[PDB]
Design an enzyme around this catalytic site. Structure first.
Site, PDB file in Angstrom:
ATOM      1  N   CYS A 106      27.256  43.349  38.802  1.00  0.00           N
ATOM      2  CA  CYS A 106      28.408  42.566  38.411  1.00  0.00           C
ATOM      3  C   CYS A 106      29.416  43.402  37.642  1.00  0.00           C
ATOM      4  O   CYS A 106      29.102  43.950  36.588  1.00  0.00           O
ATOM      5  CB  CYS A 106      27.955  41.373  37.538  1.00  0.00           C
ATOM      6  N   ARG A 109      31.086  42.034  33.698  1.00  0.00           N
ATOM      7  CA  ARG A 109      30.246  41.820  32.525  1.00  0.00           C
ATOM      8  C   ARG A 109      30.906  42.035  31.159  1.00  0.00           C
ATOM      9  O   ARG A 109      30.290  41.703  30.138  1.00  0.00           O
ATOM     10  CB  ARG A 109      28.947  42.641  32.628  1.00  0.00           C
ATOM     11  N   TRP A 278      35.364  33.893  37.676  1.00  0.00           N
ATOM     12  CA  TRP A 278      36.575  33.803  38.487  1.00  0.00           C
ATOM     13  C   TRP A 278      36.554  34.979  39.445  1.00  0.00           C
ATOM     14  O   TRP A 278      35.781  35.911  39.264  1.00  0.00           O
ATOM     15  CB  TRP A 278      37.830  33.878  37.634  1.00  0.00           C
ATOM     16  N   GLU A 283      37.365  40.368  46.703  1.00  0.00           N
ATOM     17  CA  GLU A 283      36.284  39.552  47.230  1.00  0.00           C
ATOM     18  C   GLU A 283      36.804  38.653  48.359  1.00  0.00           C
ATOM     19  O   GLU A 283      36.144  38.499  49.388  1.00  0.00           O
ATOM     20  CB  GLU A 283      35.636  38.688  46.135  1.00  0.00           C
TER      21      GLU A 283
HETATM   22  C1  HEM Z   1      34.062  36.126  34.573  1.00  0.00           C
HETATM   23  C2  HEM Z   1      34.379  36.586  35.776  1.00  0.00           C
HETATM   24  C3  HEM Z   1      33.432  37.382  36.698  1.00  0.00           C
HETATM   25  C4  HEM Z   1      33.855  38.335  37.545  1.00  0.00           C
HETATM   26  C5  HEM Z   1      35.305  38.836  37.748  1.00  0.00           C
HETATM   27  C6  HEM Z   1      32.718  38.821  38.265  1.00  0.00           C
HETATM   28  C7  HEM Z   1      32.746  39.797  39.217  1.00  0.00           C
HETATM   29  C8  HEM Z   1      31.754  39.968  40.150  1.00  0.00           C
HETATM   30  C9  HEM Z   1      31.901  40.558  41.467  1.00  0.00           C
HETATM   31  C10 HEM Z   1      33.252  41.031  42.063  1.00  0.00           C
HETATM   32  C11 HEM Z   1      30.686  40.599  42.039  1.00  0.00           C
HETATM   33  C12 HEM Z   1      30.268  41.081  43.447  1.00  0.00           C
HETATM   34  C13 HEM Z   1      30.118  39.832  44.340  1.00  0.00           C
HETATM   35  C14 HEM Z   1      30.027  40.158  45.804  1.00  0.00           C
HETATM   36  O1  HEM Z   1      30.393  41.287  46.233  1.00  0.00           O
HETATM   37  O2  HEM Z   1      29.586  39.273  46.569  1.00  0.00           O
HETATM   38  C15 HEM Z   1      29.744  40.041  41.084  1.00  0.00           C
HETATM   39  C16 HEM Z   1      28.392  39.931  41.280  1.00  0.00           C
HETATM   40  C17 HEM Z   1      27.499  39.286  40.472  1.00  0.00           C
HETATM   41  N1  HEM Z   1      27.795  38.668  39.250  1.00  0.00           N
HETATM   42 FE1  HEM Z   1      29.679  38.572  38.420  1.00  0.00          FE
HETATM   43  N2  HEM Z   1      31.575  38.215  37.779  1.00  0.00           N
HETATM   44  C18 HEM Z   1      32.002  37.260  36.871  1.00  0.00           C
HETATM   45  C19 HEM Z   1      31.164  36.371  36.232  1.00  0.00           C
HETATM   46  C20 HEM Z   1      29.798  36.298  36.349  1.00  0.00           C
HETATM   47  C21 HEM Z   1      28.965  35.316  35.688  1.00  0.00           C
HETATM   48  C22 HEM Z   1      29.504  34.190  34.766  1.00  0.00           C
HETATM   49  C23 HEM Z   1      27.690  35.600  36.041  1.00  0.00           C
HETATM   50  C24 HEM Z   1      26.367  34.917  35.616  1.00  0.00           C
HETATM   51  C25 HEM Z   1      26.359  34.063  34.594  1.00  0.00           C
HETATM   52  C26 HEM Z   1      27.688  36.737  36.933  1.00  0.00           C
HETATM   53  C27 HEM Z   1      26.594  37.340  37.545  1.00  0.00           C
HETATM   54  C28 HEM Z   1      26.666  38.096  38.706  1.00  0.00           C
HETATM   55  C29 HEM Z   1      25.540  38.405  39.556  1.00  0.00           C
HETATM   56  C30 HEM Z   1      24.073  38.011  39.282  1.00  0.00           C
HETATM   57  C31 HEM Z   1      26.079  39.197  40.716  1.00  0.00           C
HETATM   58  C32 HEM Z   1      25.236  39.724  41.898  1.00  0.00           C
HETATM   59  C33 HEM Z   1      25.382  38.640  42.960  1.00  0.00           C
HETATM   60  C34 HEM Z   1      24.735  39.068  44.251  1.00  0.00           C
HETATM   61  O3  HEM Z   1      23.838  39.956  44.214  1.00  0.00           O
HETATM   62  O4  HEM Z   1      25.129  38.511  45.320  1.00  0.00           O
HETATM   63  N3  HEM Z   1      28.977  37.136  37.081  1.00  0.00           N
HETATM   64  N4  HEM Z   1      30.418  39.729  39.915  1.00  0.00           N
HETATM   65  C1  LIG Z   2      30.279  35.572  40.196  1.00  0.00           C
HETATM   66  N1  LIG Z   2      31.690  35.379  40.524  1.00  0.00           N
HETATM   67  O1  LIG Z   2      32.450  35.023  39.418  1.00  0.00           O
HETATM   68  C2  LIG Z   2      32.353  36.130  41.424  1.00  0.00           C
HETATM   69  N2  LIG Z   2      33.502  36.603  41.151  1.00  0.00           N
HETATM   70  N3  LIG Z   2      31.802  36.402  42.610  1.00  0.00           N
HETATM   71  C3  LIG Z   2      30.515  35.922  43.091  1.00  0.00           C
HETATM   72  C4  LIG Z   2      30.486  36.123  44.602  1.00  0.00           C
HETATM   73  C5  LIG Z   2      31.667  35.472  45.340  1.00  0.00           C
HETATM   74  C6  LIG Z   2      31.757  35.968  46.790  1.00  0.00           C
HETATM   75  N4  LIG Z   2      31.816  37.434  46.780  1.00  0.00           N
HETATM   76  C7  LIG Z   2      32.966  35.412  47.527  1.00  0.00           C
HETATM   77  O2  LIG Z   2      33.858  36.196  47.928  1.00  0.00           O
HETATM   78  O3  LIG Z   2      33.044  34.181  47.713  1.00  0.00           O
END
Ligand code: HEM
Ligand SMILES: CN(O)C(=N)NCCC[C@H](N)C(=O)O
Ligand code: HEM
Ligand SMILES: C[C@H](O)[C@H](O)[C@H]1CNc2nc(N)[nH]c(=O)c2N1
Ligand SMILES: C[C@H](O)[C@H](O)[C@H]1CNc2nc(N)[nH]c(=O)c2N1
Ligand SMILES: CN(O)C(=N)NCCC[C@H](N)C(=O)O
Ligand SMILES: [Zn+2]
Lengths: 407, 411
Positions: A106, A109, A278, A283
């Site tokens: 992520c 973070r 958000w 994405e």
């Molecule tokens: C606040 C805004 C946030 C942004 C901008 C963000 C950004 C991202 C992005 C761009 C990815 C890659 C997703 C993909 O390529 O499919 C990701 C993955 C992930 N994020 Fe975040 N994130 C946010 C909030 C959170 C929150 C609130 C959580 C958990 C409470 C979280 C946990 C994770 C996890 C566990 C992944 C891996 C998901 C997977 O393996 O498919 N993130 N994040």
């Molecule tokens: C966790 N979240 O906030 C986030 N930005 N992405 C989670 C994954 C969303 C997914 N990659 C999508 O394009 O719908």
């Protein structure tokens, strides 16, 4: 045992000691690196409970205190007696925030400590689950001023009474295989759409149909619920310079809410734990719209731009990619829906990494996921060495429930 | 054991058995992945198994495994090792070894071409002047007036580690970098340290933005000597854009021949510390990395200024827009001048075809995703969606420390 990571753009070198705390396995060995692979009892539970409670009491600067020792004995007595235990509200909130903190894939973070935790451990039915989920969607959406949130349903017991959200995200679009041979809507969601129709959903059979929630409570057969349409904020996609872009008929939803992962805290397993933040613009603009196996719109956009598509070396795909991503960002910003561009997000992540190295001794990070899917090397994370390792509490993948459920 | 890799775009699944023939370590453990880390005198006892492993691989490749010729060669090498502490490769074994080091190079996207490599044997070289002549001949052959041909020149192997052949340059052709008193850099910042070494050794620097560096060549453990590559042998391409006529006034050019000269080639436990090799460019190497890295020529601002993009906020994606135009200009300029170049779409598509072929015929293809995915437009190339397995096979190209850090100066 002590490891260094270098930034090759700035020459800044950081020392990682946090990896020594890592427990779970990576899938790599000394002989082979699996860094690009997407998916690489009472006796078991007490050590895990102890490891967690130790980190928690350390975090509130009460390690080795009477309150620490008493809670450890209390939980030990509870596991020995009931085969499981219950987290205090304080522990649940700490655990959820740290599962996010520990999420090596992520990039967002920097936000980890600002997470609203909705305790749904009192939930007993799928209707109750629907209510909690609507409330999460409404809170998190906040009329476009998005707020990070997680909703935590009851923990796994004997494994036949699992709470699950069958959906991969709270809000996604249906996919339909056509007689044509093509796919209408989102091909990523064809199987799950079929399952919903089979369970009785009346599909509109359109390009951007919000899927219904399929919710499973207490190991019971899952049930269908439609998210109130007025709670699903969507954004029509237009371009600040190209008048024709709007006629592609593209839209996306504002709230990315991953709903199929498992939250592990202190050995306890929360199989339904939808969380939302958000979007980062790539994405939607790069992956959702331009992956060959997704909406796959590059061709249509390039044709409307009148680019030379005869040869790859004209970089027509690259030019249309940039424009699509400009339109995504412009559309969200114009409608006052929170979104972050990949430059801003990756800059923030580098700052977060520096903070974590300074205050925690490291930051597990998966470079393969952290570097954005366009323009990789013009973002600072491309030049940043990262160490990937697995810390708990954690968000984990789990098998899709339809492979595992017994109807 | 079998390992599977999946392509998440096509659902093609491939099965790897080749990883079992890997001996060397990756840097990773069951507890940590080091996949994004850039950099994670032999005894008689350690040498004969290495030679044996290699000769078995060579004789198997020529369908002569276990033949009298194979057995006699093992015996001959064993005798030579016990007697002289080392051994000499036959010309055929050197060719096979150099091609396989390329075939095994997990960071190389160009490996579809691996079997087409001109090997120049320079193991009879004894002096830096000799090295210079070999290197000029390599450059002229490889350049071929713009119709680039892959080639490697292999100088004498390591003996006691006190008599190493080394090319001190990181590539045969590269531009000088000069740190100015005001802290700015003229030319290529990647080459500032090496430029200072050249000046110290006696080079008279023109002090321009694109000065081809002299060769700094070390033969037989002696101090290195400076040579100017004849300018008529250095093919360069002025960079212009097909639509933007102002692009040429940026004053940009680049050289046609990418010729890595600082790696070590290991074949059958022998170490070739000077083994310059060349192919042709993938456009992003120049247009993304060399021109647009903040620590290189760093041209994004100037280009975007000239395109009149909105530069007030990152979310206009001005950097991304300028990046694509620069990369169009590089491909346009090389193609217009009939200098071999490959775009990142073509190159990655070819790599996937190569990889699938390697799985079917060889049982695998070690590949480093971090390096194989191009530095722009990653996910619109097929390699982004391809799971890869990274492991180390020999023969191999390896990093070695910069020679100025280890050289014993004779005076
Ligand atoms: C606040 C805004 C946030 C942004 C901008 C963000 C950004 C991202 C992005 C761009 C990815 C890659 C997703 C993909 O390529 O499919 C990701 C993955 C992930 N994020 Fe975040 N994130 C946010 C909030 C959170 C929150 C609130 C959580 C958990 C409470 C979280 C946990 C994770 C996890 C566990 C992944 C891996 C998901 C997977 O393996 O498919 N993130 N994040
Ligand atoms: C966790 N979240 O906030 C986030 N930005 N992405 C989670 C994954 C969303 C997914 N990659 C999508 O394009 O719908
Ligand atoms: C024929 C055309 C070739 C193309 C298009 C090509 C492409 C590339 C590219 C784009 C890289 C990444 C370079 C970087 O990011 O700095 C690379 C790396 C590499 N290639 Fe090739 N290559 C070609 C030929 C060769 C040849 C002839 C050899 C050796 C005989 C070779 C061996 C290697 C090695 C060892 C690396 C790793 C370099 C490092 O770690 O710094 N390649 N290749
Ligand atoms: C095969 C490869 O691991 C896969 O395509 C990964 C690469 N990097 C990624 N990065 C992110 N952020 N999201 C993804 O889905 C992927 N996919
Ligand atoms: C830290 C990271 O490993 C480093 O920046 C890598 C990333 N991928 C790369 N890929 C290629 N082809 N060349 C490189 O120099 C790099 N640099
Ligand atoms: C090996 N070779 O042919 C090649 N294409 N690249 C080698 C490295 C070149 C380097 N990336 C550069 O931009 O000069
Ligand atoms: Zn690894």
């Amino acid at each position: 045992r002590f490891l260094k990571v270098k930034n090759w753009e700035t020459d800044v070198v950081l020392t990682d000691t946090l990896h020594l705390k890592s427990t779970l396995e990576t899938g790599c060995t000394e002989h082979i690196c699996m860094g690009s692979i997407m998916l690489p009892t009472k006796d078991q539970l007490f050590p895990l409970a102890k490891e967690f409670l130790d980190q928690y009491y350390s975090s509130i600067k009460r390690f080795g205190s009477k309150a620490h020792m008493d809670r450890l004995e209390e939980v030990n007595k509870e596991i020995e007696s009931t085969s499981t235990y219950q987290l205090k509200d304080t522990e649940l909130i700490y655990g959820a925030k740290h599962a996010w903190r520990n999420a090596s894939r992520c990039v967002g973070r920097i936000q980890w400590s600002k997470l609203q935790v909705f305790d749904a451990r009192d939930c007993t039915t799928a209707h109750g689950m629907f209510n909690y989920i609507c409330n999460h969607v409404k809170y998190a959406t906040n009329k476009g001023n998005l707020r990070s949130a997680i909703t935590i349903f009851p923990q796994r017991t004997d494994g036949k009474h699992d709470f699950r959200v069958w959906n991969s995200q709270l809000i996604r679009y249906a996919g339909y295989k056509q007689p044509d041979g093509s796919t209408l809507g989102d091909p990523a969601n064809v199987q799950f759409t079929e399952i919903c129709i089979q369970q009785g959903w009346k599909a509109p059979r359109g390009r951007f149909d919000v899927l219904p929630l399929l919710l499973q409570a207490n190991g019971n057969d899952p049930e269908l619920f439609q998210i109130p349409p007025e709670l699903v904020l969507e954004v029509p996609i237009r371009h600040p310079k190209f008048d024709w872009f709007k006629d592609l008929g593209l839209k996306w939803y504002g709230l990315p809410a991953v709903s199929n992962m498992l939250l592990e805290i202190g050995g306890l397993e929360f199989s339904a734990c939808p969380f939302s933040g958000w979007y980062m613009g790539t994405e939607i603009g790069v992956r959702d719209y331009c992956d060959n196996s997704r909406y796959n719109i590059l061709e249509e956009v390039a044709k409307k731009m009148d680019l030379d598509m005869r040869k790859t070396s004209s970089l027509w795909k690259d030019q249309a990619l940039v424009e699509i991503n400009i339109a995504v960002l412009y559309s969200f910003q114009s409608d006052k829906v929170t979104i972050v561009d990949h430059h801003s997000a990756t800059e923030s992540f580098i700052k977060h990494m520096e903070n974590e190295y300074r205050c925690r001794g490291g930051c597990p990070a998966d470079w393969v996921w952290i570097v954005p899917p366009m323009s990789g090397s013009i973002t600072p994370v491309f030049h940043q060495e990262m160490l990937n390792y697995r810390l708990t509490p954690s968000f984990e993948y789990q098998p899709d429930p339809w492979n595992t459920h017994v109807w």
